[PDB]
């Protein structure tokens, strides 16, 4: 009924996709959502429209798109809102409403993790 779509930059190296796959798995074992799909913005599959479509065909009527990026940038302000038919100027999504969330930001867990990496953990 609601779907969670985890959405990333995408890269030509495979670490970006692998990252989304690991994150998707980990939330799958939290058993919080009916449906969980990942989408990558650029040069990697699946794409964000493929993921949105997949959510819909799986039954879901309220789609939560969460951008897995550290800060706002072009992609989160122009490219993605476009790709979702949320901004006026290859895909439009039937009768279902799209719910576009905020990025990660300067979160305290991110400082936690930074300390860990600094000590070679």
Sites of contact with its own copies (CB under 8 A): 4, 6, 8-9, 11-13, 15-16, 18-19, 22-23, 26-27, 30, 32-33, 64, 66, 68-74, 77, 99, 101-115, 117-118, 120
Measured CA to CA, the distance from residue 17 to residue 9 in angstroms comes to 9
Comparing CB distances to its own copies, the nearer of 24 and 56 is: 24
| Distance, C-alpha 37 to centroid of its chain | 8
Measured CA to CA, the distance from residue 46 to residue 50 in angstroms comes to 6
CB of 102 to its own copies, least distance (A): 5
Task: Judge whether 13 is annotated as a binding position.
Answer: no
Q: Where are the alpha helices (DSSP H) in 12-96?
A: 15-28, 48-57, 74, 80-83
Task: Judge whether 45 is annotated as a binding position.
Answer: yes
Q: Indicate the annotated binding residues.
A: 9, 45, 70-75
């Amino acid at each position: 009924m609601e779907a969670l779509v985890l959405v990333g930059h995408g890269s030509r190296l495979p670490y970006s996709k692998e990252l989304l796959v690991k994150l998707a798995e980990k939330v799958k074992e939290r058993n919080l959502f009916p449906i969980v799909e990942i989408g990558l913005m650029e040069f990697s599959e699946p794409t964000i429209p493929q993921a949105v479509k997949k959510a819909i065909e799986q039954g879901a009527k309220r789609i939560i798109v969460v951008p897995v990026f550290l800060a706002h940038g072009i992609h989160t302000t122009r490219d993605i809102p476009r790709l979702l038919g949320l901004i006026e100027d290859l895909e439009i999504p039937e009768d279902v409403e799209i719910i576009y969330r905020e990025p990660i930001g300067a979160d305290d867990r991110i400082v936690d993790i930074i300390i860990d990496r600094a000590f070679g953990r």
